[PDB]
């Protein structure tokens, strides 16, 4: 389970800027913090973990000052290093079964430039040389360094471990996939691309293949894992066959939420009927 705090900061000019961030434990969103807002918002009932109303308030205020501070710093760094500017900051820890490890990566205009490593900021190999001075300035602050180290070394792992027992439930929830078939013209003359749509499954790991009874098709392509709004997943597995060779193919879906009982969709009664309920005029088709 990888826990990441993700910060988005935009600087349009000297006077206008905003910063927004969100927090992910695994693929679940736990917090959100908008520029419009004073405080960090929970997106789960258990987002506080095992910290107490006092402990969290202190950690919150800590962040509240940071956000104001980070803002003025960068504006000043820019006056030093003679807009528009985008900064991205990713920090957290990947929990091992032990034990763990931490990270605080910073990106500038889309590129990965700085990390916090050991007791200070350093520029990542192959970084621009103008950043040397800003890092020299930023490393002269003992106070930030101290608080950042505690955050990474002690505070972050002790927090996440709180979430993993508090969100025991929502993390180990199971959701059954629902699949359906369809096909589209291939890019090749007289071939057909067949689609097996799989939707609404959690957790993420899943097995989808095109079969011919025994032999699973080697031309089976797995698409990207796309998200649903309700924290479930979407995948499609496609197969290119020469038109008139669809007959005898089957989509097979293996996922932990079913147990032993797969979804085996055959190309041809069940199929025919579902293809009738999704008919349309085919504008526009790509």
């Amino acid at each position, epitope marked *: 389970y990888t826990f990441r705090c993700l910060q988005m900061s935009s600087f349009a000019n000297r006077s206008w800027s905003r910063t927004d961030s969100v927090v992910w434990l695994g693929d679940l969103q736990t917090h959100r913090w908008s520029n419009d807002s004073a405080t960090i918002s929970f997106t789960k009932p258990w987002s506080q973990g095992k910290l107490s109303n006092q402990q969290w308030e202190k950690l919150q205020h800590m962040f509240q000052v940071y956000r104001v*501070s980070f803002t003025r710093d960068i504006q*000043e760094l820019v006056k*030093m290093m003679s807009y528009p500017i985008e900064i991205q900051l990713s920090a957290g820890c990947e929990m091992y079964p032990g034990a763990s490890e931490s990270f605080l990566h910073v990106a500038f205009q889309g590129k990965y430039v700085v990390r916090f490593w050991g007791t200070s900021w350093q520029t990542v190999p192959g970084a621009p040389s103008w950043l040397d001075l800003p890092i020299k300035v930023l490393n002269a*602050d003992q106070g*930030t360094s101290a608080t950042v180290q505690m955050l990474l070394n002690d505070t972050c792992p002790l927090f996440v471990r709180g979430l993993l027992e508090a969100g025991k439930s929502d993390l180990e929830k199971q959701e059954k996939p629902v699949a359906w078939l369809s096909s589209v013209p291939s890019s090749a003359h007289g071939h057909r691309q067949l689609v097996c749509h799989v939707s609404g499954f959690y957790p993420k790991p899943v097995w989808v293949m095109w079969m011919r009874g025994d032999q699973e098709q080697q031309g089976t392509h797995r698409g990207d894992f796309l998200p649903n709004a309700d924290e479930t997943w979407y995948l499609q597995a496609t197969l290119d066959v020469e038109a008139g060779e669809e007959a005898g193919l089957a989509c097979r879906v293996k996922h932990s939420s079913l147990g032993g009982q797969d979804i085996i969709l055959y190309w041809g009664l069940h199929h025919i009927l579902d293809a009738q309920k999704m008919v349309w005029n085919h504008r526009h088709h790509h």
Partner: T-cell receptor, first 107, second 113 residues
Framework: AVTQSPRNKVAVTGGKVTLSCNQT?????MYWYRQDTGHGLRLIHY???????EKGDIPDGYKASRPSQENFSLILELATPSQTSVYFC???????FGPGTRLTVLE | TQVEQSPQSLVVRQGENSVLQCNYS??????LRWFKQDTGKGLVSLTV?????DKTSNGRYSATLDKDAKHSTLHITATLLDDTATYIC?????????????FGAGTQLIVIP
């Protein structure tokens, strides 16, 4: 360390006044404050190195300039009574302050 | 007006002790510095206080810091006639070159013979 010239100056409303700071410390950051009773020092203009110049909290009426690491002038294009004060430049990374300049602008 | 100093002017018998108060609301408060200003001359640093509960000593000068209360006091042991100057409290909002200094209007200490 930090030298200032002139130390005393008398101007007319609408005159030009340059106040010169100089440092042999080799610092990058130079500042210009002004001191008035009941205030505590107030930043007019500051600098991060040669050729760079910045607005402080009260820069109205003042242009500054940093030709080199060593020198940081505060310039008063159109002097006004309001600008009667004691001015201090400081150098450093926090700071080290000059012996001050006393300016009067008279009607 | 984030740094306020107390009392406004102080008067001590030459030989006695004097106490100077400083209250600030600057956020954040990285460090606090006491300066001496000999009438006619510039500011000169006496001491800096860093930690959440700090206490320093510069010979006859001794200072205390309390961030939880956002407060510092400067003590002078066995005041001299040389001590007749203005004492200025300055707070720094970062631990580096990017910080802004925040100046108190000062305390005027007259040391009577």
């Amino acid at each position: 360390a930090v030298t200032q010239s002139p130390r005393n100056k008398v101007a007319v409303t609408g005159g030009k006044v340059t106040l010169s700071c100089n440092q042999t410390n080799n610092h990058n950051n130079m500042y210009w404050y002004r001191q008035d009773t009941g205030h505590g020092l107030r930043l007019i203009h500051y600098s991060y190195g040669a050729g760079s110049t910045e607005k402080g909290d009260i820069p109205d009426g003042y242009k500054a300039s940093r030709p080199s690491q060593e020198n940081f002038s505060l310039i008063l294009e159109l002097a006004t009574p309001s600008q009667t004060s004691v001015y201090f430049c400081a150098s450093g990374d926090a700071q080290f302050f000059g012996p001050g300049t006393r300016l009067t602008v008279l009607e | 007006t984030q740094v306020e100093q107390s009392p406004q002017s102080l008067v001590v018998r030459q030989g006695e002790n004097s106490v100077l108060q400083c209250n600030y609301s600057v956020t954040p408060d990285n460090h606090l510095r006491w300066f001496k200003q000999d009438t006619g001359k510039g500011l000169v640093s006496l001491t800096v206080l860093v930690d959440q509960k700090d206490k320093t000593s510069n010979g006859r000068y001794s200072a205390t810091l309390d961030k939880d209360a956002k407060h510092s006091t400067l003590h002078i042991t066995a005041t001299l006639l040389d001590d007749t100057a203005t004492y200025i409290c300055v707070v720094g909002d970062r631990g580096s070159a990017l910080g802004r200094l925040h100046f108190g209007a000062g305390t005027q200490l007259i040391v009577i013979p």
